[PDB]
Amino acid sequence: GKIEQILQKIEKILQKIEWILQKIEQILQG
């Protein structure tokens, strides 16, 4: 259960990272 919880936190941090990269890619395009 504790492994699932740490993995869920890792998942959310990675999603946040992907969102920032998306923003960077837009900035770079313009």
Next chain:
Amino acid sequence: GKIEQILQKIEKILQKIEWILQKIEQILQG
């Protein structure tokens, strides 16, 4: 079962991160 599902979501987020990064690399490269 839940661990596998979270891991697969994590895998898919990283694939997307790699893909955006490939695009960022192309932008900077030319």
Next chain:
Amino acid sequence: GKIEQILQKIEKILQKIEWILQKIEQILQG
């Protein structure tokens, strides 16, 4: 037990990565 500990270190490194990325985005945005 050891799996939880390794996952917890991975979580911490990812938080550091997300933080640096937030700052990079801020630099690029301005």
Next chain:
Amino acid sequence: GKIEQILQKIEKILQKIEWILQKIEQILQG
């Protein structure tokens, strides 16, 4: 078994991400 397989896929994607980032680091200094 499936968990190991997804983790090895995750490892390989991170290796590719690291490589793209090295090239970006190099491009940024000319």
Next chain:
Amino acid sequence: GKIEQILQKIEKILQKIEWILQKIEQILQG
């Protein structure tokens, strides 16, 4: 056992990724 080994490799690549990102951030901020 193999799972622990794979996670420790992932942790190591993430450490490498963080260092590159630190350099990139410094290149951009300067």
